Each structure stands twice: as C-alpha cells, then as structure tokens.
Subunit: 267 residues, 4 copies
C-alpha cells in the first residue's frame, strides 16, 4: 500500500460526493489509518463515513471555533494513542456565503460574508497547521484542496479570491512546516460534481450563475489533453495520496494540478 502504516487526518467529509470522502477511501485502500474531522452535522457525517472501507474515529472540528482548534491535537492523540503522531493532514474545507458566489453581483457581497468565506477557506489552512504540526512526524505531509484562481471566472467570484489567499497561505505554511520536516502543498482540482456543485448547476444560486458554471465545466473537458470527468473524484483523491506518500519528497509550498492538464492549454 502507498500509505501503509501512515496515520492521516482527513477533514471535509459532508456527503458521499465530498472530495474528502474519496480521499479517505483511497487512503484507506492504500493502508493508511485515518482520523476524520467533521463540521456541525456529526451524526450525518458518522452515517456517511460508515460506508468507508474501514472504521475511523470522527472528531468535531469547526475551523472558526478557537476552542475546537485548541483541543484538536489532544483529541487526535487520544484517538491514535499516546506516543503516536500523525504522518499526514488533509484540509478539504471550503465555504463562501451565497452573496459571494454569484447569487448577486460581485460588488454586492458584504465584507462580513467575504471574511467568513476567507476564514473558512484560507485562514483555516494555517489554523489547522498550527494545531497539528506539534503532533506530526518528520517526513509528514499537509495537503489542501485548491481551484486554480490565477484568472477570474464568472460566478465563482469571491471564492476565487479566497483560493488566491489560500495559495499564498500555503507558501507561508510550508515555511513553518519545514521546521518540523513536514511538506505543505495544495492540489488544484478540476470541477467535481459534489452535491453543492450540482445544486449550483441546477440553479440554486440563480440561473445566470448555473449557466456560467455549466459552461466552465464543459470547457474543462475540451481543454484537457487527457479529458476531464467531473463525475469522478478518484483521480483527485489519488493525487492527494501521492502528496501524502513519500514519493514527492522535495515538493513543498507548491500546487499540483489534478485537472486533466486543462490549465496548460488555451483551447
């Protein structure tokens, strides 16, 4: 197994279409022993994660809750056993209020909403690294989920800005993590039909936003030299596992694109 004997924390599962659900499944297939973290709806998340190949302890983590973060390392150590540390951490957490994601004009998102989205989607990558680096082994790996924000796109709006901030945060987390012998990287995924994504395409944020997001997805498969299947998160999950493994040992502060190559082509 690619991750045999590694202890890895995976955040971000909320449904069986969450990217983190597939990260967790593949990591377990590859021999990793997991600790899961979930936000708010913990009975739902437990029921969802009962479908994973192996049972995993589930800890509550609201990344906006300073007490959750202050206690997190102790609760993880309780879950994996004293004297054991983590080898990997997966941040698969993102949120932007509807006002920031195309339900209204870009200029009409109040800063209170934007700042909540940046807190959850970008600052919390540093928050989780601060909490967990003290219980991570040398040679460990922190991975977060990205959506390439180097160019503006319709509808994604302030979530794009949040991903721009996240990419910058990752480069600073790498500086801190390196003192522990730990790498920090993001995986920039192509679009994936999660429940939230499918709802947007179905018009949950208005018809214009849904039409714009559907056009975004279609251009992706067209541009990608190997194609892109938005209904299949497994290639993204495998890429996360590659970064969690020992096989990218000189990559840190960086971004790996699991997008079919779409960002390398113009059309």
């Amino acid at each position: 197994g690619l991750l045999d004997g590694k202890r890895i924390l995976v955040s971000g599962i909320i449904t069986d279409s969450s990217i983190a659900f597939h990260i967790a499944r593949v990591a377990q297939e590859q021999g990793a022993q997991l600790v899961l973290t979930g936000f708010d709806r913990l009975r739902l998340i437990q029921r969802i994660t009962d479908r994973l190949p192996a049972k995993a302890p589930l800890l509550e983590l609201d990344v906006q809750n300073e007490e959750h973060l202050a206690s997190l390392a102790g609760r993880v150590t309780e879950a994996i056993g004293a004297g054991n540390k983590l080898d990997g951490v997966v941040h698969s957490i993102g949120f932007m209020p509807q006002t920031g994601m195309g339900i209204n004009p870009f200029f009409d998102a109040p800063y209170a909403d934007v700042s909540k989205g940046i807190h959850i989607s970008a600052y919390s990558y540093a928050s989780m690294a601060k909490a967990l680096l003290p219980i991570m082994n040398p040679g460990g790996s922190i991975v977060g989920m990205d959506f390439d924000p180097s160019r503006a796109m319709p509808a994604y709006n302030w979530m794009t800005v949040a991903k721009s901030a996240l990419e910058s945060v990752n480069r600073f987390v790498a500086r801190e993590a390196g003192k522990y012998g730990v790498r920090s990287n993001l995986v920039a995924a192509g679009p994936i039909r999660t429940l939230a994504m499918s709802a947007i395409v179905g018009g949950a944020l208005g018809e214009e936003a849904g039409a714009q997001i559907q056009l975004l997805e279609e251009g992706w498969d067209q541009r990608a030299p190997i194609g892109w299947n938005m209904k299949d998160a497994t290639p993204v999950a495998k890429t996360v596992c590659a970064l969690l493994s020992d096989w990218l040992p000189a990559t840190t502060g960086d971004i790996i694109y699991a997008d079919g190559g779409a960002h390398t082509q113009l059309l």
Copy 2:
C-alpha cells in the same frame, strides 16, 4: 501634459513619503485635476497636501466605513462640479495589524487582525470601484498598488496574503469596470522607504523582522537589471500615471511591475 484635462481621485496620502503623495505630485505636473481622499487624520493630511503643486479638495474616506463609501460619489461630484465625471481613480491604501506582519510568528496572527488587514488592503479595492464607477467616464482607469506576492517572503507574512487577495480582486474589478469602458490594473512596486517602512527596518516590529526586511531591500537592487532606489518613489508614480493615461488602452485586469525588473531575475 500626459494627463491634461483628466479628473483623478487619489487616495492614500498620509505623509510626504507616501507613494500616493508622489503619484499626486506627478499627476498634477502632468496636467491632471485631483480630488484627494484621506483617512482619520484629516488636518495632518491637509497640511501635507498643501505642499503639492496645486490645491486639491480633500474628502474623508475610511474604506471600512460603509457610510463614507455610500456618500463618496456624491461628495466627489460636489467637488468636481455637476456634469463632470472622473477619468481616473488611484487606490494606494494598505494596512495589516502588527500581529500579521512579523512582530510575532505567522501562526499567531488572530483572524480578527488578518480580516481587518484584508478588508483595508484588498476588499476595499472592490469597494472603491463600486462607489466610483458610476461617476467615471468611458476610457477611464482604476489603479491600485501591489507588492508581488507570488512567492512567500519573511516578515511580510499576512500582508503578502492580502496582496494575493488584492490581485485576485483586481481581475474581477476589471470585469465590472469593462462594462463602463474603464480599465483596472495594479502597479507592483519594489520596496519604498515610506515612514512606516523605515520604522520597520529600524526595528518597530522587532529586530528579526527589521533584519529580514533590510535583506529583502538589498537583494532587490542587486537583482534589478536597471537597479532599484528604495528612496525614490518617482519611477513608481510615473508608472501609475502611465496607466492613468491613454497610452495603455488594451491592458486591464493586469499587473505592471515597477520594480527595476527585479522579479524577472533569480539572482
């Protein structure tokens, strides 16, 4: 004059070493008629701006104050005369609490402080564009000040993250501004010895941060193929005026580097 007959709003003057002070001076030398905006210490700012080549009306603008922003367009129109619109807007506004800029470890900045810095340094670029685009002429130009955040650097810490967000915001502001026939761009400047910058080098945020920032400045002149003079903001001001002029008419959503070429060389 490069800007003859243009009406241009310039924010961001606080001392005679502010980058915006030199933007304002050069723009006036080039025939522009200015409206200035200032934050908090308006009697100080009036005294400072009395040294500009020409008298300019001074309006109060705290970019975190929604009432200041809601009234801004009406106060500008009162200053330049009914029936007149703006041709240019300069955003030269930046702030990050000391906790986010190296006085303590990167992980120790509370999010309340980071979010204040992102509000002032990044979100407010969209706020000012929202307020002023309705009173801007076609062919107009919005320019903001940037510091290249594509790579992490010591001490700048969360201000770097804020500039990453600002660059993303600029690309979305360009989408909105284009509907008015207006361009939006940033100028990424090399380091400039403002009063705040000199205080940091002198140790205002701790000795380690001061030493790191001094090393940053020295490498800049070394890398720049034409050199870099941190005591001279005039080349930065001229570049801002180039973007305010009609001579970069097909550039928008973009970043112009006024850094001596330092970002194009490794050593």
Copy 3:
C-alpha cells in the same frame, strides 16, 4: 508629443497591416524620428512606408545575415548623423515555416524549419540588441512583439515554442541592456488581422488550422473585459510607444499585455 525628440529604429514593416507599420505611424505622430529596417523586398517596403506621416530612412536588415548585423550600427549612425544615438529599438519580426504552424502535425516539423523560425523570431532579439546597444543612449528602450505562449494552443504550434524562447531571451537581454541604462521589454498582443493572419484564417495552411485560429480570435474578444478588436492594431502600437517613452522607467525584462485583458480571464 510622447516621444518628442527621440530617435527610434523600427523593424518589421512588410505591408500596411504589419503591426510595425502602426507602431511607426503612432511614434511619428508622437514626435519620434524614425529609422526603418526591412527584409528582402525593399522596394515594396519603401513604397509601403511612403504612406507614413513622415519620411524615414530605410535600411536593409535580414536578421539571419551576420554581415547585415555587423554593419547595422554604422549604417544607423550614418542615417541619424554622427554624434547622435538611438533612444529606442522596436523588434517586430517573426517567422515560422509552414511546417511549424499547423499545415502538418506538430511532430512533423523538421528541426531545420523549427530552428529557422527560432533564429528569426527569438535569437534575433538578442542579435539586434547586441548590434544596437553600443549606439543607444542611457534611458533608452528596446521593445519586442510577443504572443502569450504560457499555454499551448492549436495550430500556432512551433511559433508558440519560439515565443516561449523569445520571452526567455528578453530577460537576458534586459541584463545586458541595463549596463547601458536601457530597458528591454515585450508587448504581448492579442491577435491582429495582418495579411499573413488573414491568409491563415482563409485556409492558407489548411482548413483545420484556419478553423482553429478563427476560434482562437473569437474567444479573445469574449474573454477580454474591455473587448478586443483584431482589425485595429492602434492599441498595440500605443502600448509599444508607452514602453518607448519615459513613463515606464522601472520596468525591464518584462512583458506588457496589450490583449484587452483576455489573458486575465478564464471565460
């Protein structure tokens, strides 16, 4: 005039739709005194350049001819007068044999053809700088024409590779030019309907290449927040003149995008 009193060499005119024809026209409108260089069909080029606002001396320059390059500085000095130097140089020269530009598969271009295209389109930027820097004034400016090659695109094929090389060459030319107080930059233009470009769209290199290039142009105007008019080279010419002027004095080794902002947006 933006370029009043400046002496500027402009290469690359072959028809009245050449980008260099419009660079020359705008520069002369702005007070510059020009020296033109032309390749191969010098009687045609003289007839074309008779339509410029002012008469300009025309010198022969085949950038693959080492004797043309060795004599160039002396012939320029003869044209502008002993004791006078150049303030600006415009490289607007590009060529790739048909085998490298979509008339056949990418893999079927022989290296002899690719190397000719790289010689003319990329190496010659260094060749011209080597020949002309000894007769350039401090504060001078060298500008070359670019087409953003950061992502692959259909049909452009090995010309894209040549532009990737040119961008790298420009960063090294900036190092050399800086010793003379001279800047070196490229302007990355959106697509322009030159005679050669119109012929390709009309099928001169095969129907597939023409269809692919037409689709490229259409996406450009769609993406550009201020639009893109492929029939109007004047915004590109003005941007070149901005770099030739004194108003971007701290930019070198760099690329300015005169593309309507299209490269900053995904869709």
Copy 4:
C-alpha cells in the same frame, strides 16, 4: 513496488552521477523493467549501467540522428518482446555548447551553437515522443527533466532559453500524447552536482561562471523550506517515478517542482 510490471525507457545516463542513473536505479528498486538509451560512448555507458540493481538492454540514441530515431521503436520492441509496449519514457537529455553557458558573454554565442543546444535539449523531447508514442500503452507516462527558467540567472544563459522552449514543447507533446491515453510532464529539479556541474563550479567555463553557479546553489538550500541537498539526486528520482506511476493520473502538460520548495520563496 510503485512501478511493478511497468516497462520504462530511460535515456540520459553518462556517468554514475547522471540524474538518469538515479532515476533508473529507483525505478528498478520499484519493480520497473527498463530499456536504456545512451549517446556516443556506449562502452562507457554499459560499464556504468552494469552497477544498476538489474541488467537492462542498452540501445544507442543520438537525438540529432534521424536514423536512430526512425529505428528506435523497432529496436525497443525487439528488446522488450513483440506484443509488449512501453508504459513510461524518461527524457533526461541536455546539452548547450560552452559558448552558450557563460564561457563568454550572452551576446557572443553563435546561433549555430544555440540551435544545437535547443535541438538536443528541447526539440528532442518532441522527437522522442513522436518515435515512442506508437509503442506506448494507454495510461503511460512521458517525463522530461527541467530547470526552472521563468527568471533569468547568471551563467546558465542560453541553456535557460532552451529550458523555456522545452516547457513549451511539453505542453504540445501533452496534446499529442493524450490521443494515446499518455501523460507528458516535466520535473523541474533543483541543482544537482553531476560531473558536468561540478566541473563548472570548479571553473571549467571560467571563474566568473563558476562563482555565479556556486552562488546559485547556495541560495537554493537557503530558500527551500525543507532544504536542498545538491549532492543527493534521490528525491528527484523519486519524483520522476511518482509521475511514471499511476498516482498522478490527471496531471499532464505540466511541471512538478522537485526543488525543496525553493521556487515558492523569495528569500
């Protein structure tokens, strides 16, 4: 084994310090069955590769020899057996005549020398893909070696330009390879003390070039958040094997940085 049962062609071994020697060793440790290609000194290369963990057939390949390239697929098939195809191809080939690499000024490299270096270091990536894609399995992987050329650096000179071209070539090879279900990527390595590299630092190309290259290496370990050991090619070899494996299945046309994270930090 990460590469168990995969058939992989590895070019570029010339000494036991070649990056390709360590790629080959790690791939064999991970279960791959290799075919090696060597240039010019085939008895030397056979003696060198006798030290690999397993015997591998050695084929002659001068990438400037069209007959070598035309016969290559047939000779590989003869080596691995009819009915078998390749799963991986490693391009670890680079050369620039001394005139292009700092023994003289950048402007003094004749184009004949530059074009030879671009032929071997960039065009040949397309040449090898053209020859070998017809005998590659779906799900296969082509990997080439890169040195980040996004910024100019002293002494590397025209080799940097060649790497800029190679990166562009890789994006087009990905388009072609995708039709076969094959990925194409580069690994951008930090500096490695090969025999050629050590000779340059020792002054083989002049004292100035040696001093500049030594300063380049030292800044790399300083910038890298996890450090950089120029005497250890194993992290680079492991990264190549990661791209040859099935664990980066949605990455193509791309660049993976095995440089300690140095390119993500300014200082």
